[PDB]
């Protein structure tokens with residue numbers, strides 16, 4: 001007692017750490033698994049791609065709403081989305097399915113969220129930085145985009161749209 | 167006296183709550199993939 | 200009073216607490232209305248009639264975030280993690296420097312509060328650039344956080360000096376904690392320090408006109424994540440070394456609690472990238488690295504679960520504890536000092552798995568910035584931590600003042616304490632649910648009613664909870680103010696020792712504890728892992744600065 005419980009407490013603590021470690025390694029094994037697959041496309045490009053936010057929507061690919069999308073591969077499309085104070089250009093963004101869409105998102109003002117409802121597309125958009133992500137919706141219909149980073153008084157109202165074609 | 171019975175019961179409940187939650191959202195991750 | 204002249208450390212400990220609770224109270228007022236906002240109920244026009252100076256939902260959230268999460272918590276850390284070492288060692292802290300850090304704290308709170316209450320810094324508690332507040336907010340932040348740097352020095356002083364009188368003896372438990380705690384806090388502080396000295400301060404003053412968002416929210420997260428542990432460990436200390444007593448037993452292991460506190464000192468700092476999973480400009484590998492390290496930093500808490508659980512089983516068996524669930528019933532369920540923190544540990548449970556999920560690199564994308572995240576931490580800080588704070592007044596409040604606690608306020612506390620856990624559980628159900636359903640956080644969703652129809656049922660709970668937690672709060676204001684404004688004073692229990700718990704110790708202990716007591720060495724290790732974790736990225740970022748201009752969107 002007191003000191004017959006101490007050794008047993010120290011003993012079953014030892015197996016817990018052994019077991020809990022393993023289960024984390026199980027977890028590191030399934031996260032790495034997902035990193036090797038396609039769904040790994042959603043991880044924002046690692047390389048820095050600086051922009052001037054004071055000159056983004058006047059010059060370069062973002063300047064023009066009709067220029068938003070561009071075919072860059074055989075079945076690869078690059079969309080130039082611009083997230084700003086309480087909205088997104090283009091609205092709605094129109095994209096085909098079975099097709100890989102390389103979003104290239106930046107902001108001219110402040111930090112905004114880009115959360116495409118029904119997908120894993122969830123990325124912070126930083127002014128003077130372009131967020132580069134890779135996704136393919138096997139699902140056709142109505143994709144809506146949400147701002148999930150506080151970006152001003154109208155933040156709760158800042159919505160957008162990916163028009164994906166069947 | 168002996169075994170951490172109620173203590174191992176607690177870290178069991180925790181272990182089931184981590185799996186329910188973690189595996190349950192590991193599903194949700196692929197279903198929006 | 201004779202108390203504050205032989206233990207004036209009891210006077211400076213008292214002020215630190217009240218100041219923080221006044222803030223806690225103020226900031227908590229916006230809680231219910233936000234619980235309503237997330238039940239599709241818009242109660243703010245009502246709030247705007249109540250408090251005329253309040254301009255927007257986001258000003259109310261900023262005040263809610265800052266006052267509860269920054270001021271209240273820091274002041275509480277500074278209290279628990281200076282007074283408890285001082286009393287373990289029976290050494291008076293450097294009273295000169297002790298008061299300085301408080302005046303810094305009060306004046307830093309006053310300076311910062313002015314533009315928040317006048318709506319010239321509605322930028323939330325994360326003050327993400329380019330969102331440009333008033334200089335006087337940023338300046339206010341730095342003075343307040345610098346208060347802890349004096350604190351660090353104070354506890355170190357008490358730890359060097361105790362090492363002197365007992366050369367070669369092992370650092371006593373609590374000191375050891377507070378020490379690794381305070382060191383760990385210093386290492387982390389640097390991320391916010393640099394963000395402040397290099398960007399936010401010269402920027403809000405006018406010296407520069409650009410601030411890079413990406414590096415700004417990185418340095419931030421360098422301090423960012425560990426700060427949560429800086430809130431928490433003050434409870435862990437109390438949970439480890441005071442609770443087993445309050446339960447009627449003994450802390451079943453010394454070397455474990457040290458080991459717990461040792462690891463946090465190691466891994467609390469090099470993990471902040473588990474916040475910037477959805478950020479661009481950061482290498483994917485580095486993210487996985489930090490995610491693995493974040494998985495590892497879950498361990499100390501895991502140990503704590505086992506070590507404390509046992510400490511309340513053993514404490515329960517002593518009370519005449521039965522089989523598998525008998526000892527649970529055997530604990531002192533009439534005790535606000537005991538009940539409060541246990542509850543928070545129960546809520547900490549769904550809290551932890553929530554943290555672990557968020558930690559799994561990719562899995563973040565399911566939940567990042569959803570209502571689920573507020574779900575996560577409301578179970579951690581607002582549940583565990585704040586509860587541990589409240590019920591603790593029931594032994595800490597008499598001890599510093601001599602004011603006795605009636606059986607009325609004692610049960611009043613149980614009322615407040617029970618509601619608060621329940622409400623948080625309701626809310627936890629609500630927020631996570633909404634989080635799984637894409638509901639964003641930091642959102643005034645009641646002004647766009649039809650925007651989120653598919654959230655019918657969890658919206659009930661957040662309304663339900665909102666009522667629940669409105670009631671507990673008032674009771675808390677009343678129940679506390681009853682305790683502070685009664686002239687009932689007993690001089691004897693104001694010199695009574697703090698209810699520290701007995702330390703079950705064995706043969707193996709010494710050898711392991713000693714290695715851990717190599718604090719001068721251990722501090723270098725955690726410092727190195729930080730340069731390994733951040734250094735590569737940081738330097739890659741610092742050579743490619745793109746400063747964007749300031750913005751005001753409130």
Ligand code: HAS
Pocket residue numbers: 176180427428430431473474493494496497498500501503504505507508511527541544545547548550551552554555557558559563566567568572575576579580581584
């Ligand atoms: C005081 C509250 C703080 C704690 C504690 C905390 C815990 C963790 N967190 Fe966290 N957190 C994240 C990772 C973790 C991990 C891995 C843990 C771990 O430390 C959790 C470990 C806990 C356990 C492993 C459970 C142990 C259980 C115990 C110890 C209780 C047992 C019960 C007993 C013993 C009682 C029995 C009694 C009886 C009577 C039977 C991540 C990602 O990796 C995000 C990003 C979200 C996003 O997308 O932005 C994040 C988000 C936040 C935010 C949002 C910041 C913002 O506003 O943007 C805050 C404030 C916060 C604070 C806190 N967080 N966290």
Ligand code: HEM
Pocket residue numbers: 227228230231233234237260263264267268271272323324325573580581585640641642643665668672
């Ligand atoms: C009176 C009980 C409380 C209630 C009903 C409550 C409710 C809420 C709700 C619904 C939110 C989400 C608002 C949003 O993100 O739009 C929130 C946010 C938050 N709360 Fe509380 N809370 C309470 C107490 C506390 C406490 C005790 C703390 C910490 C000591 C705290 C700190 C925070 C923080 C840091 C946020 C995040 C704000 C942000 O994302 O910028 N709250 N609270």
Ligand SMILES: [Cu+2]
Pocket residue numbers: 423424425427471473474
């Ligand atoms: Cu964190």
Ligand SMILES: [Xe]
Pocket residue numbers: 269270307308311339340343
């Ligand atoms: Xe502050």
Ligand SMILES: [Xe]
Pocket residue numbers: 337340341391395399
């Ligand atoms: Xe700051």
Ligand SMILES: [Xe]
Pocket residue numbers: 340341342344345391392393395
């Ligand atoms: Xe600072």
Ligand SMILES: [Xe]
Pocket residue numbers: 423424426427
């Ligand atoms: Xe934080």
